[PDB]
Amino acid sequence: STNTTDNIDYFDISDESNYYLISQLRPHFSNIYFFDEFKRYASYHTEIKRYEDIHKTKVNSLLNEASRAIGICNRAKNTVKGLINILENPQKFKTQRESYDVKLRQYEEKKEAFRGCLLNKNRKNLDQIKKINNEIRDLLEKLKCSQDCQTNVYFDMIKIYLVDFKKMPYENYDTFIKQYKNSYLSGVDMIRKIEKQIDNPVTINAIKFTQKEMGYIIDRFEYHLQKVKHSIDQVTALSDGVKPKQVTKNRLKEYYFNIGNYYSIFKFGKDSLNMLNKALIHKEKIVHNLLGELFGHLEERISKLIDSEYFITESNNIISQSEETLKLAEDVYDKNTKLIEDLTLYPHLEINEFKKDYDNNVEDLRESIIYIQSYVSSIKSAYRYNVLEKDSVESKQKNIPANSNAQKKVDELLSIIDSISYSNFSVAENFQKMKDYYKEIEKLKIKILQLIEAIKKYQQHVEEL
């Protein structure tokens, strides 16, 4: 589906003074939008025809110089596009021989190289912009009224600007960047956890680079949205207002220059927000295309961990050996029990002194066997709690929606991997306990064999009485 990025013109740079912002979109300045709005301001005022003459010359010269500089750096845009379409896909990387790190370094150098070539050609047009602004100041101070002028272009064109402000959508962009940014930071939080378990570096380096680019485009979008909201608040804030009918001539000059600047910020911000919305949706689709490759390799890690952690086969080995020991000892007592029964009839008739010891041996026999049954019941009990700890994880794995759109399945698999990690402290202590008990079964096994030996020595002694 989507594996590449076609548009690059969201990249930009401002000046070192941060006063003028260049865009790679048309017409690269908000001041040109100011020049068109002051052209219609000069369509009002009959006295200033020199502005529309000059304005024709300046849109010609400025647009030609701008698109010229976009040509000279269009070749550098082709190189940077080459490194981007190397870095975004794994499939373009698997044919590539150089490792990832130096390619990332080359991406950095071509990036600031691109911004540097853009600004260094646009400086000579910035000086021309300063010339135009000074010519507009002189050309506006050509006119006549230095006492009361009127301030009908202000009181009308504000209402036209408010119609234009209610035309343009704000809340969908705001809700979009809030929900989207929440999904982005949640994404980076998923990457930091997902890096430790999955073994392949190539795909996760592609995702990490992609989220870096997403971070830059998010930062630009919050910048332009901030400029739009501030310009709307300033124009409507002047429309609240005290509404003076009378201004001085210089006050009229900074007056018109002021609101023309604000509406210029609105127009430039509109087109910038439009393009950045498209770019964020595209890169978001790239990220889902990558995680779609990732989660199939993730599930194998889960299927290894569930068998690996809960010590389940070793615990079944302990239970099998313990039940085998109980069956063995109970078999031996069932073998000797009639010989016990005769050798409880021989004591009470005669000299009881050795038979006191043998009575102690019989009590130790039956009490020992009852102890072994109690130990087996204890081990089986703790094993039951352990199996329950495993089965809750299995039910949590089976209750996932397939049916995830999008990338929430990776979040669910991280949740279940987090669950297997949480069971560790209870599982380890239960298994340690099982080891302790089986040691005590061993001790009672050596003791019970010495008991049956004591029974046989007693048996030959009673034959010797």
């Binding site: 987090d418 669950s419 949480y422 402290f425 209870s426 202590e429």
Partner: protein, 55 residues
């Protein structure tokens, strides 16, 4: 309690406590998952506690 009794500084401690106490505090089984099966949703509750202390 050492801030109140020993040093004489006023002190406050508040809990969203169930009628019976929490079943496992100093415990190996106290994890996140078992907390989130005790309490179904946690973000609004800890939000309420942070609102009280911040206020």
């Amino acid at each position: 309690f050492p801030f109140l009794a020993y040093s004489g500084i006023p002190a406050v401690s508040f809990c969203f406590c169930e009628d019976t106490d929490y079943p496992y505090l100093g415990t190996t089984m106290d994890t996140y998952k078992e907390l989130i099966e005790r309490i179904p949703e946690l973000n609004k509750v800890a939000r309420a506690a942070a609102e009280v202390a911040g206020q």
